[PDB]
Symmetry: D2
Subunit: 199 residues, 4 copies
């Protein structure tokens, strides 16, 4: 299982502010969105292109545009929503799906088998939600799905490599462990609550 | 000289739409802002950091933070404005300067700030070179010049006048026609961004 | 029950573009955000203020600021999300809540799958967001969920509403104030607003 | 002359934070965009509409859309830029003009270093944006520029206006309609609005 760590200094810096317990919901949400955008640069380096011609105001021009259907961003409710908003600023034509667990709620774009797909899950703690989500996506015919997380715990990455080995995980950072209550350590607290002000 | 070609399919795709003469002002503006954002990812990969610790809701955490003052984004009017707007989405704390070629306003102590000069179209390199001089006179150092499209001409003008400056570009075009327009380029950046002519 | 019909040229114009079936997800999502922003002007014109003073870089100044805790924006997933995003551009410090409900295609009744609200809800001005008020079943359930948790003076903001839906809320939650951009004709056999604009959610996120 | 005092709690509140000297460039910039958007709501209740039809996914619908060409937003650099950005969030298809003007810190008279306007501005609803209406010298010149190029029915939009500024515009361009967030006391020895909020441009971009 490929684990891609986004290194950029802007990611590290913003991540420092996200962890800082003194950062309020407004800044936390904006930061989380910026991190998502930055991480998407890395996660989308391999987007396939095709050649075509275009007429500029000055003269004809050989150019390259993305091939196939519009990519799909799939958010794991609730915190995953913040990553979608961030990333849509980079790719506004992206189709969006949502998956909420506990039965489960799922809505995906049509023909997801012919779309590059990205699963957004801010905190990869135990990896259970991400795992199940990946299963639902595979089942619908999704392939080559990239799991994007801001923070990941060893226990979580292991969980994914164990159930979906052929999945790439893009993360800003890998922490030490999960505490007595299932939270990533040192992590940043409850992602959802810190994003929407629902402590 | 120092040149960095931004290599990302999103950039290639968006530049394709910018060049297409059918893309209207709204989409052009949004596209230019997105390209500016993407290009900023590379242009800022070398921002310096410094270690420190912070208290998370859960426990102490070792982290790295940007060092020094806040970075400066200097726009060359008018087209440069679109790039400032796009880039600010990534670094909203950045200080902004403006140069119109005549008029110039910059953040204080720019000599102590990582600076980025924004000029969508590096054609003859004339505007950008003058701007770099004005910036050098004011203590600016290690300036990266960011252009969407560049002509070999402008690149050579900058290599000759300011060999110290690094140039970040999205694509290097053929030449300049007998009207100073980049070929194949995309026309008048400003007019296409704002809907003028 | 009180209903506030929002009348503004930009809202009508954009609503025309939202209804047009030729409008794809990107533009539809942006239009919905803009409409929400515009409707927020009227729905928040009654926010309470209190006097205070600040130092200007020129001199002291007597000013007025909002009083009380930050307001709460509660979205009914999925379509409500777009309204919350647009409104946050005006009031970025607002706290956000989410109520997950999807309408059963057969019974046309709401199915709950999630709810999360800011704390001290009874102490904040509350706004419930969901673009389409059809039968009113989902909004009514949401209104109940908010009520049982202490919310009061709730303003339900919808872009389009069917008379049937308005009647359902007046019946179930008379104290609710409903702000809308337009009132349409009726619902069809499948529970869709006519002429309406189709399935908000699918048209916002490009789903089916 | 016609003066609209945008009266809305969100505007008063945000104005309070813009005035407060502790507000940094990032927040100041966001606040100005937000205030500009709220003000645009009033300034554009004016937009003429026309009747037409479209096909919704459900059925045909009679609707209304804006008539004529896209409206023009003309900013007075530098400070005007922030207002254009905020307002674009509501009307993204608007054409943007730019008039470069700065005030000689001596004669308090404006110096012109740039002007670019949308084509056929005579057939577009126009809005001139300049956060601070101090002596009014800048806005007055700007209005003269717009006038000679065919613009008419122009609404000058400012966040703060001083009496001497309104009088200057009332004197040079009486037909101009002004929309403001608040009218202040006077101008100090340096031409700054009292109590105002200091130098707008500098506070927006972090210059000095």
């Amino acid at each position: 299982m490929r684990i891609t760590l986004v290194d950029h200094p802007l990611v590290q810096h913003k991540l420092a502010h996200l962890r800082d317990k003194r950062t309020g919901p407004k800044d936390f949400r904006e930061l989380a969105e910026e991190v998502a955008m930055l991480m998407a640069y890395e996660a989308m380096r391999d987007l396939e292109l095709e050649e075509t011609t275009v007429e500029t105001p000055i003269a004809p021009a050989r150019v390259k545009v993305l091939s196939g259907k519009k990519l799909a961003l799939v958010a794991i409710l609730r915190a995953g929503l913040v990553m979608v908003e961030g990333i849509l600023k980079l790719v506004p034509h992206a189709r969006v799906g949502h998956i909420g667990l506990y039965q489960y709620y799922i809505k995906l774009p049509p023909d997801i088998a012919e779309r590059r797909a990205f699963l957004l899950d801010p905190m990869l703690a135990t990896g259970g939600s991400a795992s199940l989500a990946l299963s639902l996506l595979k089942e619908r015919g999704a392939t080559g799905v990239k799991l994007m997380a801001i923070l990941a715990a060893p226990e979580g990455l292991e969980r994914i490599a164990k159930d979906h080995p052929d999945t790439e995980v893009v993360v800003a950072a890998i922490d030490e462990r999960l505490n007595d209550h299932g939270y990533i350590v040192p992590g940043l607290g409850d992602a959802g609550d810190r994003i929407y002000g629902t402590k």
